[PDB]
Design a protein around this ligand. Structure first.
Ligand SMILES: OC[C@H]1O[C@@H](O)[C@@H](O)[C@@H](O)[C@@H]1O
Ligand SMILES: OC[C@H]1O[C@@H](O)[C@@H](O)[C@@H](O)[C@@H]1O
Ligand SMILES: OC[C@H]1O[C@@H](O)[C@@H](O)[C@@H](O)[C@@H]1O
Ligand SMILES: OC[C@H]1O[C@@H](O)[C@@H](O)[C@@H](O)[C@@H]1O
Ligand SMILES: OC[C@H]1O[C@@H](O)[C@@H](O)[C@@H](O)[C@@H]1O
Ligand SMILES: OC[C@H]1O[C@@H](O)[C@@H](O)[C@@H](O)[C@@H]1O
Lengths: 113, 113, 113
C-alpha cells in the first residue's frame, strides 16, 4: 500500500540521524601538567562517570579522583612544589567543582550563578 | 494487524535512541587560572551561549565575557601581573577567538585556515 | 487515513529532536600557550579529524599535527625555551596521546587503564 510506504520512508530518513549522533559521541578528556618532570593528570569523562590517570615521570597509574560527569574541564597551579587542582564536572546544567589541595578531593564553592 | 505491527516495532526501536542522546547532551566548560592566589575563570557554553564565572580569592562572581558558542576552549598567560586570555568559541565549524588584554574583550585574528 | 495516522504522529514527535541534536553538534577545540610572546596552538577536532593552528607573534599558520579524533585535550610545558606538548585525541573510548618534544610528533605511552 501507499499509506504503509509513507511511514516506511519516514523510518528510513529518521534512522539516518541515529548513526551521525552515535558517530560523534566519543569520551571527553581534560589534561593539566606542572613542574619540570613533568607531572600530568588526564581526566576522562566516560558514560556520566569521570576518572583520573596520572604520570609522575615513570609510568601511568590511576589517581584517586572518582566523580560523576558527562563533560570535564581542569586547571592546576603550584604554591611552591605543592599542586592545587580544580576539576569542573558537568551533568545536565550542573557544573560541580572538585578541589585537590594536597590530601583529599573536596566539593568546591563554585556556583554557575 | 501485522502491517500495523511492523511500524509499531520500528517506532519502538527508534524512539528509544532519541531520549538517551538528549539525556546525555550536557553543558561544556573551559577553565584557566594564574598567579598564586589564584585567579580562576570558568567559561560555560550552555545552549549556544557562553558565560564567564570569576574567582579572585574571595568568592565567585559573573565576568564580562558574553558571546555565542556551543563549544569553548581557553588559554591565558601573564605579562608581569597583567593577565592575557584567549577564549575559542565554536558554532557549526566556525571557531571564533575572543581576546582579553586588560580592558575589553575583542574578536581575535584567529582563522581556522 | 486513521490507521496510518498513528505513525504520522510518532514521526511528528521524533522529527522533534533531530533538529536540536544537529543544532548543538559543533566542532571541538583545545588551546595551549607558552612564553611571553606568546606562542599559542589551537587543536580543532572536526569530523573525526583533528588539525593544529599556530600563532608565534606574526600571524596564524597550520601546524604539523594531523591525527584522527572526535574530542581533543592539550597541555604543554617548557624545559627552558623548548616547548613540550601532549595532545589527547579521543575516538569512541580510545584516548590516544600524541607527544611533541622539539622535532616530531610520536604516539605516547598513555593507556586509559
Ligand atoms: O599521586 C596521585 C595523586 O596526585 C595528586 O596530585 C592528585 O592528582 C590525586 O588525584 C592523585 O591521586
Ligand atoms: O578551598 C576550596 C576553594 O578553593 C578555591 O581556590 C576555589 O576553587 C573555590 O571554588 C573552592 O571552594
Ligand atoms: O575581574 C573580572 C574580569 O577579569 C578579567 O581578567 C576577565 O576575565 C574579564 O572577563 C572579567 O570580567
Ligand atoms: O591582540 C589580538 C591578537 O592577540 C594574539 O595573541 C593572538 O591571539 C591573535 O589571534 C589576536 O588577534
Ligand atoms: O612551528 C610550528 C610547530 O610548532 C611546534 O611547537 C608544534 O606545535 C608543531 O605542531 C608545529 O608544527
Ligand atoms: O616521551 C614520551 C612520553 O612523555 C611523557 O611525558 C608522557 O606523556 C608519556 O605518556 C610519553 O610516552
Amino acid at each position: 500500500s501507499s499509506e504503509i510506504a509513507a511511514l516506511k520512508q519516514e523510518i528510513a530518513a529518521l534512522k539516518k540521524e541515529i548513526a551521525a549522533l552515535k558517530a560523534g559521541a566519543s569520551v571527553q578528556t581534560a589534561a593539566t601538567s606542572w613542574g619540570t618532570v613533568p607531572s600530568i593528570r588526564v581526566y576522562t569523562a566516560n558514560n556520566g562517570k569521570i576518572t583520573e590517570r596520572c604520570w609522575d615521570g615513570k609510568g601511568w597509574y590511576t589517581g584517586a579522583f572518582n566523580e560523576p560527569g558527562d563533560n570535564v574541564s581542569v586547571t592546576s597551579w603550584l604554591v611552591g612544589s605543592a599542586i592545587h587542582i580544580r576539576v569542573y564536572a558537568s551533568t545536565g546544567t550542573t557544573t560541580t567543582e572538585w578541589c585537590w589541595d594536597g590530601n583529599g578531593w573536596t566539593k568546591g564553592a563554585y556556583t554557575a550563578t
